[PDB]
Amino acid sequence: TLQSSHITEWLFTIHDDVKKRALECFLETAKVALKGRNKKFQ
Amino acid sequence: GALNNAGKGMIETNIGNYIQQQINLLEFIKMEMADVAGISKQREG
């Protein structure tokens, strides 16, 4: 079944790229909320 | 006396042998394409 996982592996590699970039995008949004008087980050 | 006999006729066309012949050719062409690419059906799964 490993070679049948290769047929769909191309769909997962672009998915892990979006998850990589959306988490970098979430991290930069979170860096900006820090300077906004939110005591949750404490 | 065939008016009280002979049994009932059938409008039967044998399209199922033609449908099976086309299905068997599709498995042949899908197999030849697999061999020329070096990517088996065992190699596809």
- Beta carbons within 8 Å of B34's beta carbon, 6+ residues apart: B40, B41, B44
Contacts of A10 in chain B (CB under 8 A): none
Resolution (A): 3.1
How far B32 CA lies from chain A's nearest CA (Å)? 19
Q: Do B44 and A7 touch (CB under 8 A)?
A: yes
What is the rounded radius of gyration, in angstroms, for the C-alpha atoms of chain B?
22
Way it was determined: cryo-EM
SS3 content of chain B, % helix, strand, coil (to 5): 55, 0, 45
B44 touches chain A (CB under 8 A): yes
| Contact call for residues B40 and A6 (beta carbons, < 8 A) | no
CA neighbours closer than 13 Å in the CB half-sphere of residue A22: 6
Contacts of A4 in chain B (CB under 8 A): 44-45
* CB atoms closer than 10 angstroms to residue A15: 10
Handedness of CA B23, B26, B34, A15 (dihedral sign): negative
What tokens does B15 get?
């399209």
